[PDB]
Write a protein that binds this ligand. Structure first.
Ligand SMILES: Nc1nc2c(ncn2[C@@H]2O[C@H](COP(=O)(O)OP(=O)(O)OP(=O)(O)O)[C@@H](O)[C@H]2O)c(=O)[nH]1
Ligand SMILES: Nc1ncnc2c1ncn2[C@@H]1O[C@H](COP(=O)(O)OP(=O)(O)CP(=O)(O)O)[C@@H](O)[C@H]1O
Ligand SMILES: Nc1nc2c(ncn2[C@@H]2O[C@H](COP(=O)(O)OP(=O)(O)O)[C@@H](O)[C@H]2O)c(=O)[nH]1
Ligand SMILES: COc1ccc2c(c1)NC(=O)CN2c1nc(C)nc2c1CCC2
Ligand SMILES: [Ca+2]
Ligand SMILES: [Mg+2]
Ligand SMILES: [Mg+2]
Lengths: 54, 324, 437, 427
């Protein structure tokens, strides 16, 4: 087994052992979808208050 | 009560296991996709092992070993025997085999050319000499040495294969069913047409001449070996079979064992063997979803409940344990 | 030195953050009032622990942390707890009403009201950083705040800090300890929205740590305090390299380099050993070989799965205690001959090992006993996809009947986001199987 | 997270008064509003149902509504009557005469605005209002007719708050008038639209329990209300006391209601106890679990084996092994998995409170959203149709301005509710 890149310090040791070798959306778009859902909420509430007005 | 589900209705074996479980009065069956089961008699393809063992308050058991397909596929078995040092390339009970992709072609051709200096009959899975024919027939298959000198029963000069049923429980105990069957060829064996060369039940449909259903069981075959060859089934054949079953399952135990798993597995295996004219046993294939013989369905399936199911879910020997 | 900011969202994120920061102070020798007599550079410095702590003129060591919850009763216990002096009031943010186990209520309705405040408080910590690497985000999959608001936060952190890494410590839902029936919905929704914004996510199935507490700690009914003290031990093992001198996993980018070759497959499996009960009078201390062998038992993993029926892409061994490289290599040699450890053909078969000589630190009066050596294994195995199969199947059962969907649509969410999130999960499952078969 | 309690009509105020009697004793508050308890678990979440008053008295956040002064004067004379804020008494003089139309359209319209003024003053003082809980019957006129008019108007002013009700269903076994199926069918139509959670307290189920199980030959309303007050205490345990689950009304609705219209819960209680009767053997955890699921313990006269549980909630109260509670609850689900829908995984959630109710060392309260509740609505739909096919007694309602068309609409909607509960009984 190969043991490579052994680094030692006073806190401990680091190394690597090898056995076998190989064989975003914009802020503009985020706010737009946050307000498209708020629009849908206010619509659904408006339909409720319209129904209660009847 | 215990609860179980059935996800393979085409399973002749576990159809009988379901009836026996229900008749106990301590097992009730749920719907296919009800998660609150104790036992799963699952499907054969893409069984969801990743969903087992996550129901609180339920000990879950399944009738299949995840990863056992590497022993029950013709291509997987050959790769396993060659690459596993427990079995090795020098394995004395497996015929020479090579995996061909329509590969090992160049390495295979070297053996077939070394077979030209001398018999060179092979089978692909069909049967042919020389071997150039079968390659164009293949165009995944596996080519294997055809056993040209098999043991032939008399009267009839017949070919046969030996099927042994093996159950491995949640503890990885290996249970060999004391009852096996010889699937006979009711056609005389011709060394120079595949009805005599292939011993499959469906291929035989001279059928039924010497015994009912072309199925000779162990009692008659033992008496034949005594009268004809002055030996017994135990000494001449069954010792090698138990060695091959033991060796094959001990090899893959680290890969399939459910000893410390959140769910448990058992599985019924069907081992098929070939016997040559010198009473040497050869393993040909392993089946992960085998069907039993009608004469033995009642006894074997009852032994599955006793040994594999009731051992985990107890209520209010027909096997030979292979020791390791 | 480069700083890391921790963000704790929802109940699970806050209480686990409590456990971690309690453990950090004990390891680094920081007192509940923020004082650290070990520190000789008063008022600042670029030591390794300053990655997680800032320093004031009075000598206080302040966590680079922000706690967010849409409902105040959980963070209020932090405001009056043992470490109340540790945190500044501005880095503890609470709302009035929570998300009610509703992803859409935490992401859209209530999340919009508080997101700009949190990012401002987050910006106040980043302005005290000379070289910010990124963020560690602690949250739950099932919570309405842990799922809904975190995904909204992860979206905005990618916008405001594009060149920074973002790691997750996510609590996978387990019905044994959860009180919400719609956690598969919240989990799939938040995994879909966060996937492209998270560079590395360490999942912790509550079922796994629950049974570990039952089996190995002799605790009949483990509480969140039992669970979180064990979780923080694993988290500390993972973050020890960022807080201590060493050469392995020194920055957040090295986590993705060493563990995540495929961006979408960024869910390493964590296995930890030994977990020993403090009430066990007689205990035989386990060797390097025994604890390294335990890293391959599913009973010790943070997610119950079978790594034998998958393939590895990377594997780190993080040792704490009396461990030397000679014994690690001997243990690895014997383990390879006896276990099914299959790497993908485009990866080298090997382990990156990090050893910290200081043994694991335990909370006084806790359930964990002091061990002479422990190890946490980080292994990116395709076997962890079993948890996605479990989660997606439960999602499929409920969504086929549109059960509870009206709660999410009633918060402005469209029914299309469900199937959009589920198709992404379907793509993730096939990516795993393509690599692992 | 404060809750505004409202009680309307004769039945609503009598079970409402007994509710405040029971939970004031649990929280250690005397009739004078002073606290004289031992544990501080009694005061941690006391803000949910009580306002802290002068001298640190505790005044219930309760609003008492009726169209006649009779029953409400009985409340003020009752054992805890002086604990209620006197300004929250709102009453007319005409009464409603068991007439849904009088309560909902004529007599109750005169009084509803003054009720909303008291509701508004209680809500503006709330730090974070959860919603409302209403106690009322559906067979009378005030609690049924005016109660639903209040619910409709409360939803208009507070559209983002939870509406919870304790609704007593009529039964010919405990019948005041023949027109009770009319008032119930008219009220259920309103409850389907304008409430988030309704506890179906069936007077038929309360009668059979008092008769068949408790061996009371002639049950009074006091015997029926003893069962109501025990259930109301249990179902509100996780709202009033701290535990591993500090529940609220919204989380309760989100987790119990998979489809908005199917929000009618079968309550259940164990052990069943008769008044003034002391039994000295505490029940084991297996016994509480088996009984609380028994049909004989359901407060709605429905056979749960005729349907399937969509969601289940359970409260165990007392000193007991929570592990044994886990084992026994998991046992019921794994032993009767047929009666829980498989398309809502892990649809049973349980909580444990250390403080038991008065008189019992161990108790269990059952909250079930079962599709078998359609039997209750079927029963009332049959009694409704028997009279309505002859338009019998309709003149009492048309004389207050109602049209036959409104009865047909209410009949249709309840039959639709029955069909919708039948939709998921087979899926
Ligand atoms: N390990 C652990 N899991 C927790 C803890 N608290 C909650 N959970 C899990 O988190 C899930 C519920 O999410 P929560 O974090 O409680 O909810 P939230 O993030 O506050 O969101 P909302 O309450 O809905 O507004 C459940 O599956 C719990 O099991 C904790 O302290 N430790
Ligand atoms: N190397 C070989 N030498 C001689 N005969 C062989 C042979 N390989 C196969 N056979 C014959 O071929 C028959 C069928 O082969 P095989 O068992 O692989 O197919 P199969 O898998 O479809 C039947 P099963 O699944 O029940 O075992 C065997 O019964 C045997 O008689
Ligand atoms: N359980 C119970 N039911 C009651 C009580 N009082 C009345 N009822 C029922 O409620 C219906 C009568 O409604 P009621 O409240 O008296 O009319 P209201 O005053 O106009 O609201 C009948 O079906 C009664 O059986 C009570 O104290 N307890
Ligand atoms: C079906 O799954 C459920 C069912 C109910 C709830 C929850 C999940 N979860 C909650 O937070 C609220 N809740 C509850 N509410 C209230 C007020 N009393 C109780 C519970 C559960 C136990 C008693
Ligand atoms: Ca310093
Ligand atoms: Mg919360
Ligand atoms: Mg009356």
């Amino acid at each position: 087994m190969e043991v490579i890149e052994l680094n030692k310090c006073t806190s401990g040791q680091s190394f690597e052992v090898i056995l076998k070798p190989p064989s975003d959306p914009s802020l503009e778009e985020i706010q737009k979808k946050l307000e498209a859902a708020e629009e849908r909420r206010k619509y659904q509430e408006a339909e409720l208050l319209k129904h209660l007005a009847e | 009560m215990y609860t179980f589900v059935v996800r393979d209705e085409n399973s002749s074996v576990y159809a009988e296991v379901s009836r026996l479980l229900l008749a106990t009065g301590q097992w009730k069956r749920l719907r296919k996709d009800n998660p609150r089961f104790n036992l799963m008699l699952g499907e054969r393809n893409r069984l969801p092992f990743g969903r087992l063992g996550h129901e609180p308050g339920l000990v879950q058991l399944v009738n299949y070993y995840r990863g056992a397909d590497k022993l029950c596929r013709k291509a997987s078995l050959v790769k396993l025997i060659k690459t596993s040092p427990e079995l090795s390339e020098s394995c004395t009970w497996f015929p020479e085999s090579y995996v061909i992709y329509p590969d090992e072609r160049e390495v295979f051709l070297a053996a077939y050319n070394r077979r030209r200096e001398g018999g060179n009959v092979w089978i692909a899975k069909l049967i042919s000499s020389e071997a150039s024919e079968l390659l164009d027939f293949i165009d995944v298959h596996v080519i294997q040495k055809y056993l040209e000198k098999p043991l032939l029963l008399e009267p009839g000069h017949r070919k046969f294969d030996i099927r042994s049923w093996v159950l491995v429980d949640h503890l990885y105990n290996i249970y060999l069913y004391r009852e096996g069957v010889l699937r006979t060829s009711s056609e005389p064996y011709n060394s120079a047409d595949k009805t005599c060369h292939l011993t499959n039940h469906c291929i035989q449909k001279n059928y039924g001449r010497y015994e009912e259903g072309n199925e000779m069981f162990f009692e008659e075959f033992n008496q034949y070996l005594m009268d004809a060859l002055n030996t017994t089934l135990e000494n001449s054949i069954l010792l090698q079979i138990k060695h091959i079953i033991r060796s094959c399952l001990m090899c893959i135990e680290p890969a399939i064992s459910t000893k410390h798993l959140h769910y448990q597995s058992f599985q019924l295996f069907g081992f098929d063997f070939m016997v040559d004219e010198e009473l040497k046993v050869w393993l040909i294939e392993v089946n992960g979803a085998p069907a039993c013989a009608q004469k033995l369905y009642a006894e074997l399936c009852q032994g599955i409940v006793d040994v594999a199911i009731s051992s985990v879910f107890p209520l209010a020997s027909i096997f030979i344990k292979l020791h390791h | 030195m480069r700083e890391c900011i921790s963000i704790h969202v929802g109940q699970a994120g806050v209480q686990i953050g409590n456990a971690c920061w309690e453990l950090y102070c004990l390891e680094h020798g920081i007192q509940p009032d923020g004082q650290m007599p070990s520190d000789k550079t008063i008022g600042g410095g670029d030591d390794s622990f300053n990655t997680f702590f800032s320093e004031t003129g009075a000598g206080k060591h302040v966590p680079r942390a922000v706690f967010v919850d849409l409902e105040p009763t959980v963070i209020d216990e932090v405001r009056t707890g043992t470490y109340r002096q540790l945190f500044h009031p501005e880095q503890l943010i609470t709302g009035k009403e929570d998300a009610a186990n509703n992803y859409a209520r935490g992401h859209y309705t209530i999340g919009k009201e508080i997101i700009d405040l949190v990012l401002d408080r987050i910006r106040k910590l980043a302005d005290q950083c000379t070289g910010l690497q990124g963020f560690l985000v602690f949250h739950s999959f099932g919570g309405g705040t842990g799922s809904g608001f975190t995904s909204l936060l992860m979206e905005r952190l990618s916008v405001d800090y594009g060149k920074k890494s973002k790691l997750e410590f996510s609590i996978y839902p387990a019905p044994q300890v959860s009180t919400a029936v719609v956690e598969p919905y919240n989990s799939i929704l938040t995994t879909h929205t966060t996937l492209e914004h998270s560079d590395c996510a360490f999942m912790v199935d509550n079922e796994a740590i629950y049974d570990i507490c039952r089996r190995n700690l002799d605790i009949e009914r483990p509480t969140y305090t039992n669970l979180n003290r064990l979780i923080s031990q694993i988290v500390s093992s993972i973050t020890a390299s960022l807080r201590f001198d060493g050469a392995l996993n020194v920055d957040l980018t090295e986590f993705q380099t060493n563990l995540v070759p495929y961006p979408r497959i960024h869910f390493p499996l964590a296995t930890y050993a030994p977990v020993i009960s403090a009430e066990k009078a007689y205990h035989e201390q386990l060797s390097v070989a025994e604890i390294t062998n335990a890293c391959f038992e599913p009973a010790n993993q943070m997610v119950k799965c079978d790594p034998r029926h998958g393939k590895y892409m990377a594997c780190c061994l993080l040792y704490r205690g009396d461990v030397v490289p000679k014994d690690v290599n001997a243990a690895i040699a014997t383990i390879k001959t006896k276990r099914s450890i299959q790497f993908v053909d485009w990866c080298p078969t090997g382990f990156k090992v990090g050893i910290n000589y200081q043994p694991p630190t335990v909370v006084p009066g806790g359930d964990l006993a002091k061990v002479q050596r422990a190890v946490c294994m980080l292994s990116n195995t395709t076997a962890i996809a079993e948890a996605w199969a479990r989660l997606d199947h439960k999602f499929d059962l409920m969504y086929a009947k549109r059960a509870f969907v009206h709660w999410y649509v009633g918060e402005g969410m469209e029914e299309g986001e469900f199937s959009e999130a589920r198709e992404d999960m379907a793509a993730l499952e096939k990516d795993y199987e393509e690599v692992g078969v | 997270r404060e809750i505004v309690h409202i009680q309307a009509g004769q039945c609503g105020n009598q079970i409402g008064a007994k509710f405040w009697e029971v939970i004031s004793d649990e929280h250690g508050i005397d009739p004078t509003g002073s606290y004289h308890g031992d544990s501080d678990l009694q005061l941690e979440r006391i803000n949910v149902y009580y306002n802290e008053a002068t001298g640190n008295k505790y005044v219930p956040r309760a609003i008492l509504v009726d169209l006649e002064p009779g029953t409400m004067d009985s409340v003020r004379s009752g054992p805890f009557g002086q604990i209620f804020r006197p300004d929250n008494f709102v009453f007319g003089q005409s009464g409603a005469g068991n007439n849904w139309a009088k309560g909902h359209y004529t007599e109750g319209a005169e009084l509803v605005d003054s009720v909303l003024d008291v509701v508004r003053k209680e809500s503006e003082s709330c730090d974070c209002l959860q919603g409302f809980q209403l106690t009322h019957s559906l067979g009378g006129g005030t609690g049924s007719g005016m109660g639903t008019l209040l619910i409709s108007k409360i939803r208009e002013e507070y559209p983002d708050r939870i509406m919870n009700t304790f609704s007593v269903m009529p039964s010919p076994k405990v019948s005041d008038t023949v027109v009770e199926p009319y008032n119930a069918t008219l009220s259920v139509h309103q409850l389907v639209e304008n409430t988030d959670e309704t506890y179906c307290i069936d007077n038929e189920a309360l009668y059979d329990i008092c008769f068949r199980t408790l061996k009371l030959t002639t049950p009074t309303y006091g015997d029926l209300n003893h069962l109501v007050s025990a259930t109301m205490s249990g179902v509100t345990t996780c709202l009033r006391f701290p535990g591993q689950l500090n529940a609220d009304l919204r989380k309760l609705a989100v987790n119990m209601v998979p489809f908005p219209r199917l929000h009618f819960f079968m309550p259940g209680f164990a052990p069943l106890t008769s008044r003034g009767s002391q039994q000295y053997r505490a029940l084991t955890v297996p016994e509480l679990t088996q009984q609380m699921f028994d049909s004989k313990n359901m407060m709605a006269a429905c056979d749960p084996r005729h349907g399937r549980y969509l969601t289940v909630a359970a409260i165990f109260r007392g000193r007991m092994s929570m592990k044994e509670v886990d084992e026994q609850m998991l046992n019921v689900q794994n032993k009767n998995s047929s009666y829980f829908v498989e398309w809502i995984p892990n649809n049973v959630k349980t909580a444990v409170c250390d403080i038991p109710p008065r008189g019992l060392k161990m108790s269990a309260t059952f909250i079930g959203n079962s599709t078998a509740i359609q039997e209750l609505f079927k029963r009332i739909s049959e009694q409704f149709t028997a009279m309505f096919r002859r338009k019998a007694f309709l003149h009492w309602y048309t004389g207050e301005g109602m049209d036959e068309m409104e009865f047909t609409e209410a009949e249709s909607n309840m039959n639709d509710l029955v069909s919708e509960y039948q939709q998921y009984q087979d899926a």
